[PDB]
Design a protein around this ligand. Structure first.
Ligand SMILES: O[C@@H]1[C@@H](O)[C@H](O[C@@H]2CO[C@@H](O[C@@H]3CO[C@@H](O[C@@H]4CO[C@@H](O)[C@H](O)[C@H]4O)[C@H](O)[C@H]3O)[C@H](O)[C@H]2O)OC[C@H]1O
Ligand SMILES: [Ca+2]
Ligand code: NA
Length: 132
């Protein structure tokens, strides 16, 4: 998976750098994309060296799930700064994807990003939004 990435271009969830998960799989999506799934509560997924430049204050992800779930966005490590939490309610099926966004605290410079999952969700991709 790439050693570094730009916060303001699509990041593919399946191109993660490390995970604690023993269940996570790379899955297909309806339009022959890929994502991650078979995620459980407590699972973390790390993406290395994301460059936020002069700042990001939002997070958007394209996700599918049948259960209300939440995803913490942390900087640097699983115990690093909580940037925000994305609350995801059911999208209607494991294959019905929805872009869902949340606010985060302004982050600048280069940081690993850790997604922390409270339960099952399929994730295709994500991207950050620049501060104003
Ligand atoms: O070609 C594409 C197929 O690859 C794709 O397959 C889908 C792959 O993802 C699957 O999503 C799974 C569904 O099960 C979830 O686990 C459930 C979580 O809740 C629990 O209560 C329950 O016991 C578990 O079974 C898992 O988290 C999730 O990733 C999806 O079902 C497949 O259809 O489909 C699109 C094709 O074009
Ligand atoms: Ca993807
Ligand atoms: Na394992």
């Amino acid at each position: 998976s790439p050693i570094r990435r730009d916060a303001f271009s699509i990041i593919e969830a399946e191109e993660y750098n490390s995970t604690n998960s023993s269940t996570l799989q790379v899955i297909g999506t309806p339009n022959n994309g890929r994502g991650i799934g078979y995620i459980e509560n407590g699972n973390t997924v790390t993406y290395s060296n994301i460059d936020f430049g002069s700042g990001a204050t939002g997070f958007s992800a394209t996700v599918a799930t049948e259960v209300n779930t939440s995803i913490q966005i942390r900087s640097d490590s699983p115990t690093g700064t909580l940037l925000g939490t994305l609350y995801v309610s059911s999208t209607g099926s494991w294959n019905t994807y929805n872009t869902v966004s949340t606010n985060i605290s302004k982050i600048t410079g280069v940081h690993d990003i850790v997604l922390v999952f409270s339960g099952p969700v399929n994730v295709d991709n994500f991207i950050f939004s620049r501060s104003s």
